[PDB]
Every structure is written in C-alpha cells, then in structure tokens.
Design a protein around this motif. Sequence first.
Motif, PDB file in Angstrom:
ATOM      1  N   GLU A  34     -45.677 -40.246 -80.015  1.00  0.00           N
ATOM      2  CA  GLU A  34     -46.273 -38.972 -80.403  1.00  0.00           C
ATOM      3  C   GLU A  34     -45.926 -37.895 -79.370  1.00  0.00           C
ATOM      4  OE1 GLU A  34     -49.079 -42.515 -81.178  1.00  0.00           O
ATOM      5  OE2 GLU A  34     -48.920 -41.350 -79.323  1.00  0.00           O
ATOM      6  N   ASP A  35     -46.730 -36.820 -79.335  1.00  0.00           N
ATOM      7  CA  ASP A  35     -46.659 -35.812 -78.287  1.00  0.00           C
ATOM      8  C   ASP A  35     -47.649 -36.179 -77.180  1.00  0.00           C
ATOM      9  OD1 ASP A  35     -47.845 -33.982 -80.972  1.00  0.00           O
ATOM     10  OD2 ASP A  35     -49.187 -34.221 -79.241  1.00  0.00           O
ATOM     11  N   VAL A  36     -47.357 -37.279 -76.471  1.00  0.00           N
ATOM     12  CA  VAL A  36     -48.219 -37.774 -75.406  1.00  0.00           C
ATOM     13  C   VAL A  36     -48.017 -36.895 -74.172  1.00  0.00           C
ATOM     14  CG1 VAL A  36     -48.297 -39.643 -73.649  1.00  0.00           C
ATOM     15  CG2 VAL A  36     -48.750 -40.176 -76.057  1.00  0.00           C
ATOM     16  N   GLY A  37     -49.132 -36.392 -73.625  1.00  0.00           N
ATOM     17  CA  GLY A  37     -49.117 -35.629 -72.388  1.00  0.00           C
ATOM     18  C   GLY A  37     -48.632 -34.196 -72.600  1.00  0.00           C
ATOM     19  N   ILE A  83     -50.656 -28.470 -59.188  1.00  0.00           N
ATOM     20  CA  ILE A  83     -49.826 -29.107 -60.199  1.00  0.00           C
ATOM     21  C   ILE A  83     -50.506 -28.908 -61.552  1.00  0.00           C
ATOM     22  CG2 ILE A  83     -48.716 -31.252 -60.965  1.00  0.00           C
ATOM     23  CD1 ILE A  83     -48.936 -32.226 -57.968  1.00  0.00           C
ATOM     24  N   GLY A  84     -49.787 -28.267 -62.484  1.00  0.00           N
ATOM     25  CA  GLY A  84     -50.307 -27.977 -63.810  1.00  0.00           C
ATOM     26  C   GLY A  84     -50.470 -29.249 -64.640  1.00  0.00           C
ATOM     27  N   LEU A  85     -49.380 -30.021 -64.754  1.00  0.00           N
ATOM     28  CA  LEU A  85     -49.351 -31.222 -65.573  1.00  0.00           C
ATOM     29  C   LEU A  85     -48.496 -32.287 -64.888  1.00  0.00           C
ATOM     30  CD1 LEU A  85     -49.163 -31.382 -69.383  1.00  0.00           C
ATOM     31  CD2 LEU A  85     -47.372 -32.575 -68.095  1.00  0.00           C
ATOM     32  N   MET A  86     -48.907 -33.556 -65.032  1.00  0.00           N
ATOM     33  CA  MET A  86     -48.280 -34.673 -64.343  1.00  0.00           C
ATOM     34  C   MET A  86     -48.252 -35.892 -65.267  1.00  0.00           C
ATOM     35  SD  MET A  86     -49.215 -36.323 -60.606  1.00  0.00           S
ATOM     36  CE  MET A  86     -50.878 -36.898 -60.978  1.00  0.00           C
ATOM     37  N   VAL A  87     -47.060 -36.489 -65.419  1.00  0.00           N
ATOM     38  CA  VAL A  87     -46.867 -37.700 -66.204  1.00  0.00           C
ATOM     39  C   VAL A  87     -46.044 -38.675 -65.362  1.00  0.00           C
ATOM     40  CG1 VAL A  87     -45.884 -38.680 -68.355  1.00  0.00           C
ATOM     41  CG2 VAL A  87     -47.018 -36.444 -68.421  1.00  0.00           C
TER      42      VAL A  87
END
Lengths: 27, 27, 27, 27, 27, 27, 27, 27, 27, 27, 27, 27, 27, 27, 27, 27, 27, 27, 27, 27, 27
Positions: free
Chosen positions: R10-13, U20-24
């Motif tokens: 999917e659109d994960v994260g 940090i805005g987003l982290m994966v």
Amino acid sequence: HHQKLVFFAEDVGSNKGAIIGLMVGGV
Amino acid sequence: HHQKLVFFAEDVGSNKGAIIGLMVGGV
Amino acid sequence: HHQKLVFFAEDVGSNKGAIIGLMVGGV
Amino acid sequence: HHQKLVFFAEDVGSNKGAIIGLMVGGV
Amino acid sequence: HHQKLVFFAEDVGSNKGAIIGLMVGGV
Amino acid sequence: HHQKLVFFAEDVGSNKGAIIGLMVGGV
Amino acid sequence: HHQKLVFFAEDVGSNKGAIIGLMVGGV
Amino acid sequence: HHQKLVFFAEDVGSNKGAIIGLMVGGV
Amino acid sequence: HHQKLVFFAEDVGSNKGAIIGLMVGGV
Amino acid sequence: HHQKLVFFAEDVGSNKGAIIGLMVGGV
Amino acid sequence: HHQKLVFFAEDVGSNKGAIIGLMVGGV
Amino acid sequence: HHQKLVFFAEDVGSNKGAIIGLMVGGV
Amino acid sequence: HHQKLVFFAEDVGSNKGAIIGLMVGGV
Amino acid sequence: HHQKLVFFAEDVGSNKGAIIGLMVGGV
Amino acid sequence: HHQKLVFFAEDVGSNKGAIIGLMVGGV
Amino acid sequence: HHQKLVFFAEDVGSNKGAIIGLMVGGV
Amino acid sequence: HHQKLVFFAEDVGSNKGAIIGLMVGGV
Amino acid sequence: HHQKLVFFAEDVGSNKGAIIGLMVGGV
Amino acid sequence: HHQKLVFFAEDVGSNKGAIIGLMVGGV
Amino acid sequence: HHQKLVFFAEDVGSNKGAIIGLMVGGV
Amino acid sequence: HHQKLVFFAEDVGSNKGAIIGLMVGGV
C-alpha cells in the motif's frame, strides 16, 4: 596494467536551447 | 602498461542553440 | 609502455547556432 | 590489473531548455 | 583485480526546463 | 510624460574570473 | 513626451579574466 | 577481486521543471 | 506622469570566481 | 570477492516541479 | 503620478565563489 | 563473499510538487 | 500617487561559496 | 557469505506536494 | 497615496556555504 | 550466512500533502 | 493613505551551512 | 543462518495531510 | 490611514547547519 | 486607523542543527 | 484605533537539534 574506457554516444553534452552566463537588467 | 580509450559519437559537445557569455541592458 | 587513444566522430565540437562572448545593449 | 568502464547513451548531459548563471532585475 | 562499470541510458542528467543560479528582483 | 533612468557605476556586470559555457572531459 | 537615460561609468561590462564558449578534451 | 556495477535508465536525474538556486524579491 | 529610477553601485552583478554552464566527466 | 549492484529504472531522482534553494520576500 | 526607486549598493548580486549549472560524474 | 543489491523502480525519489529550502516573508 | 522604494546594502544576494544546480555520481 | 537485497517499487520516496524547510512571516 | 519601503542591510540573502539542487549517488 | 530482504511496494514513503519544518508568525 | 515598512539586518536569510534539495543514495 | 524479511504494501509511511514541526504565533 | 512595520534583527532566518529536502538510502 | 508592529531580535528563526524533510532507509 | 505589538527575544523559534519530518527503516 591500468585501463580506462569511456564511450559517449549520439548526442552527449549538446546544447539545443539557451545558455546565458550573466544577465543584468533595469526597469 | 597503461591504456586510456575515449570515444565521442555523432553530435557530442555540439551547439545547436544559443550561447551568451555576458549580457547587459538598461530597458 | 604508455597509450592514449581518442576518437571524434562526425560533428564533435561543431557550432550550428550562435555563440556570443559579450553583449551590452541600452534602451 | 585495474579497469574502469563508463558508457553514456543517446542524449546524456544535454541542454534543451534554459541555463542562466546569474540574473539581476531592477523591476 | 579491480573493476567499476557505469551505464547511463537514454536521457540521463539532461535539462529540459529552467536552471537559474541566482535571481535578484527589485519589484 | 514617461521617464526611465538607469545608472551603472564602476565595475558593474564585469568579469574578473572565469566563464565557461560548456565543458566535456574524458578523464 | 517619452524619455530614457542610461549611464555606464568606468568599466561596465568589461572582461578582465577569461571567457570560454565551449571546451572538449579526452584524457 | 572487487566489482561495483551501476545502471541508470531513461529519465534518471533529469530536470523537466524549474531549479532556482537563490531568489530575492523586494515586493 | 510615470517615473522609474534604478541605481547600481560599485561592483554589482560582477563575477570574480567561476561560472560553469555544463560539466561532464568520465572519471 | 566483493560485489555491489545498483539499478535505477525509468524516471528516478528527476525534477518535474519547482526546486527553490532560498527565497526572501519583502511583501 | 507613479514612481519606483531601487538602489543596489557595493557588491550586490556578485559571484565570488563557484556556480555550476550541471555536473555529471562517472566515478 | 559479500553482496549488496539495490533496485529502484519506475518513479523513485522524484519531485512533482514544490521544494522550498528557506522562506522569509515581511507581510 | 503611488511609490515603492527598495534599498539593497553592501553585500546583498551574493555568492561566496558553492552553487550546484544538478549532480549525478556513479561512485 | 553475506547478502542484502532491497527493492523500491513504483512511486517510492517521491514528492507530489509541498516541502518547506523554514518559514518566517511578519503578518 | 500608497507607499511601500524595504531596506536590506549588510549581508542579506547571501550564500557563504553550499547549495545543491539535486544529487544522485550510486555508492 | 546472513541475508536481509526488504520490499517497498507501490507508493511507500511519499508526500502528497504539506511538510513544514519550522513556522514563525507575528500575527 | 497606506504604508508598509520592512527592515532586514546584517545576516538575514543568509546560508552559512549546507542546503541540499534532493539526495538519493545506493549503498 | 540469519534471515530477516520485511514487506510494506500500500502507501505505507506516506503523508496525505499536514506535518508541521514547530509553530509559533502572536495574537 | 493604515500602517504595518516589521523589523528583522541581525541573524534572523539564517541557516548555519544542514537543510535536506529529501533523502533516500539503500543501506 | 490601523497599526501592526513586529520586532524579531538577534537570532530568530535560525537553523544551527539539522532539518531533514523525509528519510527512507533499507537496512 | 487598532494596535498590535509583538517583540520576540534573542533566540525565539530557533533549532539547535535534529528535526526529522518522516522516517522509515527496514531491519
């Protein structure tokens, strides 16, 4: 022994538009 | 032994547009 | 033993447009 | 033995648009 | 032995739009 | 009545360094 | 009535360095 | 033995829009 | 009545360094 | 023995919009 | 009646460092 | 023996919108 | 009656460092 | 033996909106 | 009657570091 | 032996909205 | 009657560090 | 033998809304 | 009558560190 | 009558650390 | 009459740490 091989194909590093180095304008 | 080979094909490093180094204008 | 080989094909480094070094206008 | 091979295909590193180094505008 | 191979395909690293280094505007 | 006035002082729009339009290098 | 005035002082739009249009080389 | 291989396809690292380095606006 | 006045002082819009339009390097 | 392999497909790392480094606005 | 006045002082919009439009490197 | 394999598919890491590094607004 | 006044002082909008539009590196 | 494999599919890590690093507003 | 006044002092909107628009690295 | 496998599918880690790092407002 | 006054001081909106728009890295 | 397998469908994260790091406001 | 006054002191809205818009990493 | 006065002192809204918009990582 | 007055002190709204805005991340 040392070797370096480079291949540039048909249309590498060509200009087909506009390249302006410096531009100064007024009003 | 040391070797270096370079190949440039048809229209490499060619200009088919406009190159301007420096441009100045009042109006 | 040292070697260098360079190949230019048809239209390498050719100008088929306009090259201007410096341009000062006015009005 | 040392080797480095690079290939640039058809239209690599070309300019088809506008490149302006520096722009100054009064108005 | 040491090897490094790089391949750039059709239209890598090309500019089709606008690149402006610096822009100063009064109004 | 319409008026436009522009003044460029001493070293305005001058080059005291290096301007390169296009550069291609094998090694 | 329409008027336009442009003044260039000492060294406007002068080159005191190096300008290169296009540069190509192998090794 | 040491190997590193990289592949770039058709439209990798290209610009089709606008890239502005720096912008200053009075109004 | 319409008026527009612009003044550029000593060292406006000058280059004292390096301006490179386009650079391609094999190694 | 050491191996690294990287593959970028069709349209990786390209810009189709707007990239602005820095913007200052008075009004 | 309409007026617009702009003043640029000493080293406004000048380049003292390095401006590179585009850069492609194999290694 | 050491291996590292990476695959980026069609439209990875591309910008289709707006990227602004820094923005300052008076009003 | 309409008026707009702008003043840029000593060293506005100048580059003393590095501006790179686009960079592609194989290794 | 040591192995690491990564796959980024169609539209991974792209931007289709707004990324603003820093924003300062008077009113 | 309409008025708008803007003043930029010594070193506004200058770059003394590094500005990179786009960067792609294989390793 | 050691193995590590990662798969990101269609639209992982993308931005379709707004990312603001820092916002300051006077009113 | 309408007025809007703005002042910017010595080191407003200046970059002394690093600004990277987009970064893609393999291993 | 050591193995670890991660899958993100999917659109994960992904972000579809508003992310604001810091917000400061007057009245 | 309408008035709006804004004052940005010494070092307002400057970057002394790192601003990264987007970052993708294989390992 | 309407008035709005804003004052930002020495070091408002400056970045001395790290701003990362988006980070994606494998292992 | 309408008045609004804002004074922000020496170090308002600055970042000295990691945003940090987003982290994966995989494993």
